[PDB]
Amino acid sequence: ELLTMWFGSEANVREIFDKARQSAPCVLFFDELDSIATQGAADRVLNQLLTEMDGMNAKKTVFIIGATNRPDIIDSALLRPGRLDQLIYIRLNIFKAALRKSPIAKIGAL
C-alpha cells in the first residue's frame, strides 16, 4: 500500500501519517512490513517511513504498531529507540469463541 505509484515528501506515506494526526488518539497498524528488504525508489519509502516515525514521541497521544513473520530481512533501523521500543511474539491451544450459533449443531481434544 505504501508502494503506491503516488510516492511523489507529502506522498501517500505522509498523507497516511497526517491522516492519523488529527484523529486523537489513533493507532497506526502496519502489516506486510516484510517488504523492508531488497528483492529506482526500491529501498526508498523505508527511509521515508523512518524519518516520519520520530517526532511522534512528543505527540504522546499517538502509537505505532507493526507486524511481520520473518524478523531477519527487516532492517534493524526501526528497532532503534523512538522508532520502536518493544517486541511481542505471536499456553498450548487456547479457547476460541465461534459465532453463527443459529445454523450450528452440537472439541478441545482435536
Add this chain to the structure above:
Amino acid sequence: GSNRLVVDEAINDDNSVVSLHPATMEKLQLFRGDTILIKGKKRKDTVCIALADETCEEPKIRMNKVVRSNLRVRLGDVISVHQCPDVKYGKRVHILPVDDTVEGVTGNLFDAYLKPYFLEAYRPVRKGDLFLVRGGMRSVEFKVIETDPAEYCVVAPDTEIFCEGEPVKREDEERLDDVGYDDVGGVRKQMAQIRELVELPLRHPQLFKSIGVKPPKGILLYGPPGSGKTLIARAVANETGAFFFCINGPEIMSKLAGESESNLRKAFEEAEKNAPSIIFIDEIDSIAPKREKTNGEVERRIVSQLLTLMDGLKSRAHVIVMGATNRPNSIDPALRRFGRFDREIDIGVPDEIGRLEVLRIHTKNMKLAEDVDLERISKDTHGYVGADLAALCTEAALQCIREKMDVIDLEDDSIDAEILNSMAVTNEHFHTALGNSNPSALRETVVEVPNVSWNDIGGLENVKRELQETVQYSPSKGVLFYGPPGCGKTLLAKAIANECQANFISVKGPELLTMWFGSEANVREIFDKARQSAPCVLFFDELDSIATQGAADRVLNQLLTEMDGMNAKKTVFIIGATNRPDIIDSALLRPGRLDQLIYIRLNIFKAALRKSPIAKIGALAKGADITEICQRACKYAIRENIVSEIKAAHFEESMKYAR
C-alpha cells in the same frame, strides 16, 4: 557624557519603574524609591521612580515603551535625568479614557481598569500624559487631564479620582498598543543584527549624506510562512520612527500591467519622497517565482521592473527595502546581489526559551490563574510558530467565553464591563484547546539551544581538552562517536553545547533521504542553515545508511563535498554517530572530513529525575535499557483505587523477561 544617558529596553514593562546602574546612581545621589524628573526632547518631561538594577550598562537607562512615547523620544536617544525632591501627594486627579481604545467596552473604567493600576501603587503624574492599562482581553489607554498639586502629583490610596466624563481624543500620540520590540519574542538574537544595520540609515540620516560608504539598502527576510516576518519589520519601523509601506504580493498580480507597473513605481516613488523609508515586499514568492522559464509575460516584467527600480533608485536616498518570502530559494537569483538584498536574515522556529517570551506577550491582557504554569507549556510546543502560539491563545481565551456564559443574557451592544476583566482563564482552557492541537513547522531544520544537565551522563573521563575558546595564535574539526547503541551516542553531543552555549541541529540518515534531493537540496539547506548560526554543532545520527542495501549511493558523495571548506570557517564543528563501523565508506575518515574517533569504567552513576512520586542500587550492575526499566517501574503504578510509589518487589518482576 556623565548625566547623558542612552535609553534602552525595559526588563519590566512598568510605566513608572525605570532601572539604572547603582554605581551611576552612587554618583548622582540616589537610591531606590526616590523619584526623578526625566526630560527627553521637545521640552516634554515626565517623572518616575528609579531602582538599583546592575543588569543595565553604566551609560544606559532602562525605559518602557509607554515611558518612551511620553517624552517624544525613541530608543537610541539621549535623555537627561534631574533629581525631583520638590514633590508631594495629590488630592484630585481627573482621568479620562482615550477615544481610540474605548471601543464597545463600558462599565466603569475606575472599578475595573484604574483601581488595579493604582491600588497600593504610588505613581507620579503629569498635567498632559497618556498611559495604557492591560486588562480584560484588551487594553484601554487613559489620559491624565488635570493635576492638583502643580504638575507633579503622586497618586495614593488618599486620592479622589473623578473618572466621570467623555472619551477624550488623541493628538499625534502613536498607539501605545502599536507593534514594538517588546511584542516580538523568540528572535531576540535575530533582532540584534537587524537592529545593528538599520539603526544608522534610519535614526542617523546625517552621515549618509557625506560618507562614500554604501549603506545597507536591501534586507531579505525569510523563515516560516506561519510567523516571524511582518512583525520583524513592523516592530522596527513603527518603533524606530520610519514610514512603513508594505506592498503585498497578491494585490500586484491582480492587475493587467496597470497597477502592476504603477504601484511598483508609485510606491517606490512614494516611499522615497519621505526620509525614513521601510518597504515591505510581502509575498515576494508570488511576485518573483525564481527563474521561471515557463510563465506569462507579466511575471517577466513585474520582476523586470523591480530590479531596475532598486539598482538605479534606492541609492543613498535613505530607503531600506525589505523582502519577505517563505523560502530564500523560490525567488530570482538576481534579487540577492549587490545593493539589492545583499543582507539576509534567518527567522527560525522559536526554541523552548523563545516560545515562553512570545507566550507572555500575547497572554498579558488576560487575567490567568496560579495553576497556569506557562513554563510547562513552553516546553512541549515544538513545531509551533508565533502564529500557532497565537492561534491557541485565541482558542484559550474564547473557550473561557462559552464556558462562563450562564446568567449573563440579552447581551447589549456595549455589554462588556467588569465581567470582561478578572476573567480567569483556567489551564483547562489551554488543555482542551490544545487537545485539538495543530502545529505547522514539522519538516523544518530546527535551530534551538540544549536544556539538558551534564550531571546525567556518568561517562569515562571525556578529556576536557576537546574544546576551545576561539583564542589561539589549523585545529581539528572532525569527530565521530561510535560504539554500542544506547551508551550515549545520541545524547552525548547534546550536553556539550550546554556549556559551549551554541545551537545544534540533529539530523538523521533517512532525513537526508528526503525526496527533495533535487545541489541546494535539503542536504545543503541543512548545511547552510547552520552556517549563519555561529557557532553551531551539526550532529548526525543514523549515519549507518552509508552503504548499499537511482540516487541510492548518492547523497553520500553529496555529503562528502560539503564537509570540506568548513575548515576555514573555524567556528563550526561536525559530529556523527554510528554503531556498525564497517559498512561506512572510509571516505569520511579522510583528513578534513573527520579527524577524530571516540568510542561509546564499569557501570557509572546515573542521575534520575521525577523525585516527587519517587520512593526510596549499584549492586544491580552485576544506557542499554536505562530508561526502559525506569518507565516500567513507573508503569508499575499500583492502581489500588478501591501512598505507594516505587518499590523493590516490582523490579524483580521486570528483569524476568528483559534482554
Add this chain to the structure above:
Amino acid sequence: GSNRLVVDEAINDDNSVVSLHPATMEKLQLFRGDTILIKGKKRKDTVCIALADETCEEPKIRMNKVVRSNLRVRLGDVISVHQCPDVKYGKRVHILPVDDTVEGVTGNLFDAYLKPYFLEAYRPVRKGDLFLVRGGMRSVEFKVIETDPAEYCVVAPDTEIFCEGEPVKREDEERLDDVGYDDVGGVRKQMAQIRELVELPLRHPQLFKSIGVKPPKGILLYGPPGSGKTLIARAVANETGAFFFCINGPEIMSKLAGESESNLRKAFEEAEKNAPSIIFIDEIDSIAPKREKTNGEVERRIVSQLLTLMDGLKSRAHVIVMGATNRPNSIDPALRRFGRFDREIDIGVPDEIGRLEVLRIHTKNMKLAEDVDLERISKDTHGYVGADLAAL
C-alpha cells in the same frame, strides 16, 4: 439560572416530545405525560409533553428541529418552561396544508398524512403554528389555523378535523425540511469542533466588537468528492441563522476576467454587508490549482484577487469563509496561513456506525418493512460515501 434551560439536540425527532433531566424535573414538580408551556423569544410559545431522560444535561433541554422553529429560537438559546395544568381536550381543529409543500401531491391529507400523525397520539395545539409530516417519499408541512378551546387544544380520537380548504401560505417560516444537524450523519465528532469555533462569531457577535482576540475566520473543509462537504456548511448556516452564499468554482472560470474579478469582489462585498456571513467556496480545487507555474493569466489573478480580499477584508467584520476541496494538497500553500484557512476539518468516509445514521435520515419519508434490517446493510457498505448512500 435554575429555570433557564439551554436548548439541545433531540434523540427522538418528535414534534411533541421534549426530554429533560429527572432531577431537574424533581425540582419543578413534573413527571412523564404532563404538558408544559415553553416560550422562547419574540413572545412566541408552544406546548409539549415532557419525559424523564437522564441522558441530557441538568441545565439543558432537548428540542426537535420543528419544535425549535416554532418558538423562533435556535440551538444555543435560553428558553423558559412553565407548568400548564389549565388545558383540556378539543372539539374542532382546522388543519390546512402549506403552499410550498403541496407540490403535485393530492388525494386527502387527512386519510394519508394527518391520520397516522394523530392516530392514538395526544398532542397539544397552538392557534398559529406549523409542523411537518414525513410520509410518502416526501414531506408536506401543515398549518394549524384554529383552536376550539382557547389556544391550548389537545388532539385525541375525539376530534373533528375539517381539513377541507386551500393550501395556506407561509410567512417568514423557514422550510422545516431545510438542512439541519439532524440531516448530517457519520461526522458527529467532526461537527463537534466546527460547532465549537463558529458558535461564537455567528450566534454571539457582541464580544468580537470589543475583544482584541482574533477569532476564527478561515475554515477549510476537505474530504471526499463524493459527499460530506456542502451539508457540513449548509446544515450550519441554515440552522445557526447565518447568511449563506456558496460561490461555485466552475462558474467563476466561465468568464473573461469580467465576473471573475467582479463576483469575487461583489460576493465578498455582499456577504460583509450582512452581519452573519458564511461564504462557501465550492470547487476551490478549480480556482486554486496549487502552485501552478504552467497555466494562464486568469488563474494567476483569480487566486491573486482572493488572498488580498481575505487578509485585508475578513478581519473582525463577522465573516467566516469556508473553502471546499477534494484534497487539501491541490490548492495554493498561501491559502492556509494566518487568518486565511488556518482552520482545517477532516471529512472521512463514514464508519459502520456513521453509515447507519445517514441511512436513517434519508430513509424517513419512506414506509419500510420489518424484514428490512438497515443495520445489516450498514455493515457491508465500506467505500460508500453519503452520496452513494443516497444514490442507492
